[PDB]
Each structure stands twice: as C-alpha cells, then as structure tokens.
Amino acid sequence: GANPYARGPNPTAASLEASEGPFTVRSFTVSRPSGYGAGTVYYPTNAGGTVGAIAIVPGYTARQSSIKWWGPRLASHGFVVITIDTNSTLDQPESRSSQQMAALRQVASLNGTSSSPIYGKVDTARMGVMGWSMGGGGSLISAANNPSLKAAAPQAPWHSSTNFSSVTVPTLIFACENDSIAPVASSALPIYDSMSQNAKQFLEICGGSHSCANSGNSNQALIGKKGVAWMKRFMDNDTRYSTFACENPNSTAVCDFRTANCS
Structure with missing residues (x-):
C-alpha cells in the first residue's frame, strides 16, 4: 500500500532548491562522543514519523564547519544528521569510516x-x-x-x-x-x-x-x-523523488554528469 517512510509534502524543484525544507530543525552537541571526536546532531521537530539517520565526516585537517551546511539542509527534509569531528584531524579513511559508523x-x-x-x-x-x-x-x-x-x-x-x-x-x-x-x-x-x-x-x-x-x-x-533527492529516494524508498534523483539536472553548474541503474 502506502510507503510508510514517506515524509513531507510532494517535492518540487523550487522546494528542493530552497535553503530550508518543510520541517523545523533543532540541534545539540553530543555530550559524550562514543568512538569519535565530537558531534552535532540536527533533527526535525515536526516530521510526523520516525526518520532515517545520516553521518557526515570532514576531510584531512578539517572540522564540522566544512560540512555543517548539510545538517540543517537534510534535517529540514526529514532526517537526523550527525556531523563529526574525528579523534584526530589527521585520521585516514579507514579510521574515518570506523568513526562515521560509531556516530x-x-x-x-x-x-x-x-x-x-x-x-x-x-x-x-x-x-x-x-x-x-x-x-x-x-x-x-x-x-x-x-x-x-x-x-x-x-x-x-x-x-x-x-x-x-x-x-x-x-x-x-x-x-x-x-x-x-x-x-x-x-x-x-x-x-x-x-x-x-x-x-x-x-x-x-x-x-x-x-x-x-x-x-x-x-x-x-x-x-x-x-x-x-538521493537520500529521500534511497533512504525512504520515496519514488516521489525518482526523477529528481535520477535526472541530469538542467544546470550551468554541471560539467560532468553520469548515472546508472537509477529508478
């Protein structure tokens, strides 16, 4: 029948391009990070059902600032998002993966x-x-x-x-x-x-x-x-987002586009 994971109003280009999705967002600092350096959790206050979670990790030397904008952007569309600092700014990919999963x-x-x-x-x-x-x-x-x-x-x-x-x-x-x-x-x-x-x-x-x-x-x-769109399509199985997820976007800003096995 209906998709149990669908959240929020039907999407449009404008609603996805906007700074803010439909949900109100709050955030907190993780009190006792478990297996990583530090974290901030962003979450919707009014999503209407449980939502998936996304963990986001910076690059070498970098901190949460580099990736922070995703927290509100995704959470406002109905996700819990944790942005992390790693145990060391000089941690390598394998360590970053462990830390991301710990988050x-x-x-x-x-x-x-x-x-x-x-x-x-x-x-x-x-x-x-x-x-x-x-x-x-x-x-x-x-x-x-x-x-x-x-x-x-x-x-x-x-x-x-x-x-x-x-x-x-x-x-x-x-x-x-x-x-x-x-x-x-x-x-x-x-x-x-x-x-x-x-x-x-x-x-x-x-x-x-x-x-x-x-x-x-x-x-x-x-x-x-x-x-x-990608996260909605695949974390929520939300095919309302299939075209936004799979399409070659009509943008001056795109200089290489490829996709496979998208639906």
Missing part, C-alpha cells in the same frame, strides 16, 4: 535515551553516509563494509584505492571540476567507474575547487537538491 551507533543510542531530543525520532534500520575527501572515501568504505546502509553521497572523495566494486549501496558522488587535491580524473571518476552493482550517479561542479560542496559554496540550490 551512527551513537545516534541509535540516543534514539533510545529518554533525555535526548531525538528519543524515538529515528528509524535505526535506515541510515546513510556522507563526507568530504578522506571522509568521502570513508563513506564508501562504510558502505562496502555495511551493505545495509541505504544510501551514500560523498563529495570530492579520495581513498588510497579507487576500487569500490564491492559497494551495493546507492551512491551519489559529488565531484569538483578543478580539484587540485584529489583530481577528478584520478580519484572521483575512477571511484565512480569501479561501482558495477549499484544505483549510482556522478555530478561534477563546473569550475569547482576541492571545497566546491562544502559550507559556503555557491551551488547550494543544485547540490542540496541532489543530496536531499
């Missing part, structure tokens, strides 16, 4: 903690992973190791290996055309091309530096639309 674990913990703002707000069976650069590579490692994850949407990813052929999780890769740190041709695009078993998408931002999908980027309408 998802702690969101599950807090969903069961009566004092927490997110008590009973999370569907702990529906989780997703995002992150920047090494944190993007960490997201792909998370997905490879935990195939029950429902979606992955890393940005400007890097890992020491580009072979993510084992990933069966729906994966959207944001890439940055002019990336000097993790060049698209040797990092993001090979990673994309390695994935053969999944729904997948590649979206490269014209003229973008390595930080082109970070807080303060000038393409929040497009990037935020795609990130929310």
Whole structure:
C-alpha cells in the first residue's frame, strides 16, 4: 500500500532548491562522543514519523564547519544528521569510516535515551553516509563494509584505492571540476567507474575547487537538491523523488554528469 517512510509534502524543484525544507530543525552537541571526536546532531521537530539517520565526516585537517551546511539542509527534509569531528584531524579513511559508523551507533543510542531530543525520532534500520575527501572515501568504505546502509553521497572523495566494486549501496558522488587535491580524473571518476552493482550517479561542479560542496559554496540550490533527492529516494524508498534523483539536472553548474541503474 502506502510507503510508510514517506515524509513531507510532494517535492518540487523550487522546494528542493530552497535553503530550508518543510520541517523545523533543532540541534545539540553530543555530550559524550562514543568512538569519535565530537558531534552535532540536527533533527526535525515536526516530521510526523520516525526518520532515517545520516553521518557526515570532514576531510584531512578539517572540522564540522566544512560540512555543517548539510545538517540543517537534510534535517529540514526529514532526517537526523550527525556531523563529526574525528579523534584526530589527521585520521585516514579507514579510521574515518570506523568513526562515521560509531556516530551512527551513537545516534541509535540516543534514539533510545529518554533525555535526548531525538528519543524515538529515528528509524535505526535506515541510515546513510556522507563526507568530504578522506571522509568521502570513508563513506564508501562504510558502505562496502555495511551493505545495509541505504544510501551514500560523498563529495570530492579520495581513498588510497579507487576500487569500490564491492559497494551495493546507492551512491551519489559529488565531484569538483578543478580539484587540485584529489583530481577528478584520478580519484572521483575512477571511484565512480569501479561501482558495477549499484544505483549510482556522478555530478561534477563546473569550475569547482576541492571545497566546491562544502559550507559556503555557491551551488547550494543544485547540490542540496541532489543530496536531499538521493537520500529521500534511497533512504525512504520515496519514488516521489525518482526523477529528481535520477535526472541530469538542467544546470550551468554541471560539467560532468553520469548515472546508472537509477529508478
């Protein structure tokens, strides 16, 4: 019958490109981070049902600031989002993946903690992973190791290996055309091309530096639309979002677009 995971009003381009989704968002600092450095949890106060959870990790040297904009953007569409600082700013992808999963674990913990703002707000069976650069590579490692994850949407990813052929999780890769740190041709695009078993998408931002999908980027309408659409489609099984998730967007800002096995 009806999709039990559908939340919020029917989407439009305008509603997805807006700064804010339909739900009101609040946030808190994690009191006692369990297996990672620090965290902020963003959550909808008025979603109308339990929602999935997404953990987001920065890149090398970076902190929550780099990725913070996703917290309100996703949460306002009906997700609990945790942004983390790693135990060390110099942690590598494998460690970042462990920490990202520890953050998802702690969101599950807090969903069961009566004092927490997110008590009973999370569907702990529906989780997703995002992150920047090494944190993007960490997201792909998370997905490879935990195939029950429902979606992955890393940005400007890097890992020491580009072979993510084992990933069966729906994966959207944001890439940055002019990336000097993790060049698209040797990092993001090979990673994309390695994935053969999944729904997948590649979206490269014209003229973008390595930080082109970070807080303060000038393409929040497009990037935020795609990130929310992908997560809605795959974490919520919400086919209202199938066209937004799968389409080549009509944007001046897109300089490479690829997708496979999308529905």
